[PDB]
Each structure stands twice: as structure tokens, then as C-alpha cells.
Design a protein around this ligand. Structure first.
Ligand SMILES: *[C@@H]1O[C@H](CO)[C@@H](O)[C@H](O)[C@H]1NC(C)=O
Ligand SMILES: *[C@@H]1O[C@H](CO)[C@@H](O)[C@H](O)[C@H]1NC(C)=O
Ligand SMILES: *[C@@H]1O[C@H](CO)[C@@H](O)[C@H](O)[C@H]1NC(C)=O
Ligand SMILES: *[C@@H]1O[C@H](CO)[C@@H](O)[C@H](O)[C@H]1NC(C)=O
Ligand SMILES: *[C@@H]1O[C@H](CO)[C@@H](O)[C@H](O)[C@H]1NC(C)=O
Ligand SMILES: [Zn+2]
Lengths: 49, 596
């Protein structure tokens, strides 16, 4: 919903079986990392908004 | 939920991790190639091992989803690419010995040295000196010695190794779903699931055979002309009805006849078009060479180069202390980074090569939006085809005069067109029979039609029947003639060159119709036509998402490769060859051989 903050990392249960709080098959951590390097092209460079 | 959504989330995670890992590997490789040192080698090795391990892990993971439940026609292709089992299905000992055989073949090909006859002073490697001798030396005896010595040096050594290689790769293919390793190689051209645009793995065989059946008249007439010229150059060695001897073709394997332009020149008086002196007089450098190449793609409607590209790319040879490889390459490192590694000097060939590389980068930029697995050309041929169409258009006299390198005074006659068409003929038409023959031989060997005891007999018989080339010194089964070629030794597919050769001229015909050119196809420039640029960009943006059949339909209006554009391109030379071959026999007789 508009203007909402979520910070809790629960292992995504896309599969039909509970993840039990660990990573594995059909169990991925929701958070993913940008990697910023000077040689990256415009459009992948980090932008401050 | 459904496995389709599960597979979708898996693909998203894989894409976002693989982009970063591939960027690290590509940056390590670029650093190694630009600046060769032990630390750079260690970093590149680490990055490559990490990327290979990640690909193996993700390929093992992806096998959970059956492809039957996937019906998006994009997720299916990505999961198919991941499930191709890059993880070696073979046993541990089988994999270790296959790697050992590949390493041994590469080592023997790279370190194969030929020594002088009864002279231990020098033992020459293939690439540095022997290739130059074969290319430029006009000594029949020396060329025959070089060819025979290289054959005995490498083919005899690699024959048991090549037999073990074919056995192991056939076992790998049998372990996979593909019939044989030829089927594994042809699987790239396969299209499944899209009715009305589909392709079959065996359909490539029929298409290649039919295309060569159409090409054969032009090759026969060019063969007759080259036979007459080489008979004039070497009086006693060449027979009128017989096939050409192998060593006199121009290179070690007969792949390219470009070295024969001097011997078979149509008109000596007419000088070839070359802009080296003009560029020197106008004081150009590599940076503005690449800028002029960029202006062409800007004119056709495609985007222009990135500031990051200009900053990071090394287009000029550093020289002095710096050590680097000078093989031209266009790098799509990933995440918006594009670079050229080229030691570019002020020459016409370097200018055209710069055009070719920037064509590569425009393709890479176009398919950047698509997922990582699909971020490639639709088939192995389209990528160099897109390079080669730009290379061909750049060298046109109209483009040269528009740029201003060529003076307004000059006008092209019949002789200049004939000379240029015949040079490009020896470059392009000549390699098609060799590629056809090599792929047919290798496919038959993989399928098992050619027995081991008749490997080389069938090889040379098919070369005599198809390519019209006869072995100078007869060779028994101990020799392994194909093993000498680089692609055969290092296990590279070779039908890509045939497909590229057809595709580039189909693209050129389509884009010349788009540009509304009137006249012969050779004097066609697509510079200022924005219709042709958009028609190309339609395919360039797709990547592998759509089938290559649909991409080719989008560009040229046909779902299958056709040699009609190539024949239309070389029609003037075809007429000139009819005229010149009135007093020369057309066709070759198999019976004649230099021996007996
Ligand atoms: C790859 O090999 C595994 C066994 O290691 C098998 O389960 C899987 O189906 C194979 N994939 C294909 C498409 O050959
Ligand atoms: C080239 O790219 C720049 C942006 O990097 C753009 O402003 C410019 O219009 C493009 N074309 C020309 C002719 O410079
Ligand atoms: C190459 O890389 C090394 C670091 O490994 C660096 O010290 C050197 O300046 C670079 N350039 C050359 C020409 O060696
Ligand atoms: C393309 O357009 C430019 C515009 O200045 C012109 O100078 C050039 O001659 C044109 N090229 C061709 C081949 O028509
Ligand atoms: C082209 O060929 C015709 C027929 O021989 C000839 O009359 C004409 O002058 C030629 N043009 C040239 C010299 O390029
Ligand atoms: Zn290329």
C-alpha cells in the first residue's frame, strides 16, 4: 500500500512446503543486493532519490 | 501456486545473481587481456571457476521443474537452457579422460612444430612462419612439403586421439536425449512449440544440401577460372580436367582463397580501392576512425556509443611497457558496459573491422533488455552476420565518397566492380564448399555412417567430389587430415560460417530493398535510410526470445535461409565468368591426381 515500510526478512515460500526459516529449493531470501561499480553504464549506476 | 510461478521466481533470482557474477568474470577476463600479468591471470581463473560453479549449481537446481508444465514460451526456453546439463552426465573417469583428450588435442595443435628437411636448425610452428610460407611462397615443392609435413606432424598424432574423442562425445550424446553429437550441435537451430515457425534438427541437413545444390554452378565457374589462372602460374602441376591440388589453394586447409587474388587478378592495370594514403594525408587516428564508424550507425537510426564505452574501451595500441592481445573483440560485459579491445591502426582493413565490432556492440545493446539467458543472438550465425553486413556496406565506394576519403573525380568502371566482386568471391564463395564438406564429414562420422577404417578415404573422396580438391601426396588411414584444422582440433562447430554467409546476403537484400536502391547489389549503402535501420532493429532487439525463424521472417520476409540473395549479389561476376570460361572447361574430373 502507498507509503509503507517493510524490513522483516522471511524466506519466501513460493513452493507448497514451509521453508522453516532457511534457504533452499523454492526458499529464497527476499532481499537482493545492488552491486555498484564505477564502470557500470548509465541506467545501472546508483541514483540518489 | 503453479510450478510456472515457482519457475518464474527461480528465474528472477537466477538472473539477478548471474548478472553480477558474469560481470565479475567478464571484468577479470578484460583485465587479463588488456594487461597480462600473474595477478590478472589469478583473478581471471578465480572468477571463471566461481562462475562455472554457480552455473553448475543453478543447472542442477533447475531440473526440478518439468518443462511440460511450462507454457510461457520464454520461461520454457530459459529453463531449457539451464537444463542442458552443463553438469557432465558422464562418469568421473570418463569426464576426466575427455578433459585430458581435449587438453592433449589443444596442446598438440598449438605446439605442433615442423622442422626443415634434414636440417635441425629451425622447427617452425604452424601460425607464425608456415602459414606465411603457404600464403605467399610460389614454390610448388616447398608448398607440397609444408602441407605433407604438417599433415604427418599433427594428423598422425591426433588420429587415435580423435577416435577416442568421437567415441566419448558420442557416448555423451547418447547419455543426453540427442541422437549423436552432430544432433547435439544442430540442436541450436531447433525450434519447438511454435507451430508455423518450427524447425527440425534434421531439417538443417536438407536446407544445407539444397543451398549447396543451388550454389554449385557459381562455384564451378569460379573453380574453372581459378584452375586456368593457376595453370598459367604453375604450368605442369595443374591439369585442365582434373581437380585442383590441395596445397596450391592458398592456405594450409584450403578454407580461404584470399591469397589467390594476386595470381588470379582480372585486370592488373586497374588499382584496387584503398584509402590508407588518403587517411594518412588527412591525418586520422583510431579515435576518429571509430567516431566515423559510429556516425554510420547514428545515420541508420541506431543509438550511439556510451560515454562509459569511450572512457573504458582501449581502441589504440598502448605499446611500450603494456602487454596485451591484439585480436579484435567486442565485449558485452553486462549491466550496461560495452567495450572494444582492438589495436587499431590507420588502415582501411582496421576501419572496416571497427565497423564490424561496433555492429557487434549495437546488437549487444539491442538485446540488453532481455533476460540474461536469452541475451544472445538468435542463432550462432546472426551475430557475425550483423557484423558483416555493416562491414560490407562500409567499404562501398558511395560510402567512401560520402565520408570524403575518396575524391569526387574518381568513378568506378566495369573493371573495378569485377575485381572487387572476384576478391569477395574468393573470400566468401570459396569457403562455402569447404565448410559444407567439413560439416558433412564430421556429421557422418558422428552418426557412424563413415567407418573408422574408411575415415580418411571417405574424407578425401568427398573433398574430391564436392570441393574439387585433390590431395598432392596420397595419404593412408594413419593420417587424420581434418585434425589439422583449428576448429576440428579444438572442437568448434563449423556450420556457423555457412549459415552466416547465407544470412548476411539475405539481410543485405532485405535492407537494400528497404533503402530503395536501384542497380547492382554490391554498390548498396544503407547509411541514411532509417527504414533499413528500424527493420534491422526489430530483429536486433528480440535476442533469443523469439525463434530465429521468426527473426529471419521479420527481417527478410522468409522463414528459411535462401541463397538467392547471394546469387543476385554475384550475378555480375557470374556473367563475367560465363564470358571468360567460353574457352575453359567447366566442371572437374575426379580421376586425375598428382600421384600416378
Ligand atoms: C540431466 O541429468 C540428470 C541426472 O543427473 C537428469 O535427472 C536430468 O533429467 C538430465 N537433464 C536432461 C534434460 O538431460
Ligand atoms: C549521442 O548521444 C548523446 C547522449 O550520450 C545524445 O545527446 C546525442 O544526441 C547523440 N547523437 C549525436 C549526434 O551526438
Ligand atoms: C598492469 O597491472 C599491474 C597490477 O597487476 C599494474 O601494476 C600495472 O601498472 C598495469 N600495467 C602495466 C603496463 O603493467
Ligand atoms: C547522408 O546525409 C548527409 C547529411 O549531411 C549527407 O552529407 C550525406 O551525403 C548523405 N549520404 C548519402 C550516402 O546520401
Ligand atoms: C563496360 O563494358 C562495355 C562493353 O565492353 C564497354 O564498352 C564499356 O566501355 C565498359 N565500361 C568500362 C570501361 O568500365
Ligand atoms: Zn565479427
Amino acid at each position: 500500500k502507498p507509503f509503507e515500510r517493510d524490513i522483516s526478512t522471511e524466506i519466501y515460500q513460493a513452493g507448497n512446503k514451509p521453508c522453516n526459516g532457511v534457504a533452499g529449493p523454492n526458499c529464497y531470501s527476499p532481499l537482493q543486493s545492488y552491486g555498484f561499480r564505477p564502470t557500470y553504464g548509465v541506467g545501472h549506476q546508483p541514483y540518489r532519490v | 501456486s503453479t510450478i510456472e510461478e515457482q519457475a518464474k521466481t527461480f528465474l528472477d533470482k537466477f538472473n539477478h545473481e548471474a548478472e553480477d557474477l558474469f560481470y565479475q568474470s567478464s571484468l577479470a577476463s578484460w583485465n587479463y587481456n588488456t594487461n597480462i600479468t600473474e595477478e590478472n591471470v589469478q583473478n581471471m581463473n578465480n572468477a571463471g571457476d566461481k562462475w562455472s560453479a554457480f552455473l553448475k549449481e543453478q543447472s542442477t537446481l533447475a531440473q526440478m521443474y518439468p518443462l511440460q508444465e511450462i507454457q510461457n514460451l520464454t520461461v520454457k526456453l530459459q529453463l531449457q537452457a539451464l537444463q542442458q546439463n552443463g553438469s557432465s552426465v558422464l562418469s568421473e573417469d570418463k569426464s576426466k579422460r575427455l578433459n585430458t583428450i581435449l587438453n592433449t588435442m589443444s596442446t598438440i595443435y598449438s605446439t605442433g612444430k615442423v622442422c626443415n628437411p634434414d636440417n635441425p636448425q629451425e622447427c617452425l610452428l604452424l601460425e607464425p612462419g608456415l602459414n606465411e610460407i603457404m600464403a605467399n611462397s610460389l614454390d610448388y615443392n616447398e608448398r607440397l612439403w609444408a602441407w605433407e609435413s604438417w599433415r604427418s606432424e599433427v594428423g598422425k598424432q591426433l588420429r587415435p586421439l580423435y577416435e577416442e574423442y568421437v567415441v566419448l562425445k558420442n557416448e555423451m550424446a547418447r547419455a543426453n536425449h540427442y541422437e549423436d553429437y552432430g544432433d547435439y550441435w544442430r540442436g541450436d537451430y531447433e525450434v519447438n512449440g511454435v507451430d508455423g515457425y518450427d524447425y527440425s534438427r534434421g531439417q538443417l541437413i536438407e536446407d544445407v544440401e539444397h543451398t549447396f545444390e543451388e550454389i554449385k554452378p557459381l562455384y564451378e565457374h569460379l573453380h574453372a577460372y581459378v584452375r586456368a589462372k593457376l595453370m598459367n602460374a604453375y604450368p605442369s602441376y595443374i591439369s585442365p580436367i582434373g581437380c585442383l591440388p590441395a596445397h596450391l589453394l592458398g592456405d594450409m586447409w584450403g578454407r580461404f582463397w584470399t591469397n589467390l587474388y594476386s595470381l588470379t587478378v582480372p585486370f592488373g592495370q586497374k588499382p584496387n580501392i584503398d584509402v590508407t594514403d588518403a587517411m594518412v594525408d588527412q591525418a586520422w587516428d583510431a579515435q576518429r576512425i571509430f567516431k566515423e564508424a559510429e556516425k554510420f550507425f547514428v545515420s541508420v537510426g541506431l543509438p550511439n556509443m556510451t560515454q562509459g564505452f569511450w572512457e573504458n574501451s582501449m581502441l589504440t595500441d598502448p605499446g611500450n611497457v603494456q602487454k596485451a592481445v591484439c585480436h579484435p573483440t567486442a565485449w558485452d560485459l553486462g549491466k550496461g558496459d560495452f567495450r572494444i579491445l582492438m589495436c587499431t591502426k590507420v588502415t582501411m582493413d582496421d576501419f572496416l573491422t571497427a565497423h564490424h565490432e561496433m555492429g557487434h556492440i549495437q546488437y549487444d545493446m539491442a538485446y540488453a533488455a532481455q533476460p540474461f539467458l536469452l541475451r544472445n543472438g538468435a542463432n550462432e550465425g546472426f551475430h557475425e552476420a550483423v557484423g558483416e553486413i555493416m562491414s560490407l556496406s562500409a567499404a562501398t565506394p558511395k560510402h567512401l565518397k560520402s565520408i570524403g576519403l575518396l575524391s569526387p573525380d574518381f568513378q568506378e568502371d566495369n573493371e573495378t566492380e569485377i575485381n572487387f566482386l572476384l576478391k569477395q568471391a574468393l573470400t566468401i564463395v570459396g569457403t562455402l564448399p569447404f565448410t559444407y564438406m567439413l560439416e558433412k564429414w564430421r556429421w557422418m562420422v558422428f552418426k557412424g555412417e563413415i567407418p573408422k577404417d574408411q575415415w580418411m578415404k571417405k574424407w578425401w573422396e568427398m573433398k574430391r567430389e564436392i570441393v574439387g580438391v585433390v590431395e598432392p601426396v596420397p595419404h593412408d588411414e594413419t593420417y587424420c587430415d581434418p585434425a589439422s584444422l583449428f576448429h576440428v582440433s579444438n572442437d568448434y562447430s563449423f556450420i556457423r560460417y555457412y549459415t552466416r554467409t547465407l544470412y548476411q546476403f539475405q539481410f543485405q537484400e532485405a535492407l537494400c530493398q528497404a533503402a530503395k536502391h536501384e542497380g547492382p547489389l554490391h554498390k548498396c549503402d544503407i547509411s541514411n535510410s532509417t527504414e533499413a535501420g528500424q527493420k534491422l532493429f526489430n530483429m536486433l532487439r528480440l535476442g533469443k526470445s523469439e525463434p530465429w525463424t521468426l527473426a529471419l521472417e521479420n527481417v527478410v520476409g522468409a522463414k528459411n535461409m535462401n541463397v538467392r540473395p547471394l546469387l543476385n549479389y554475384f550475378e555480375p561476376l557470374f556473367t563475367w565468368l560465363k564470358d571468360q570460361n567460353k574457352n575453359s572447361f567447366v566442371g572437374w574430373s575426379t580421376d586425375w591426381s598428382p600421384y600416378a
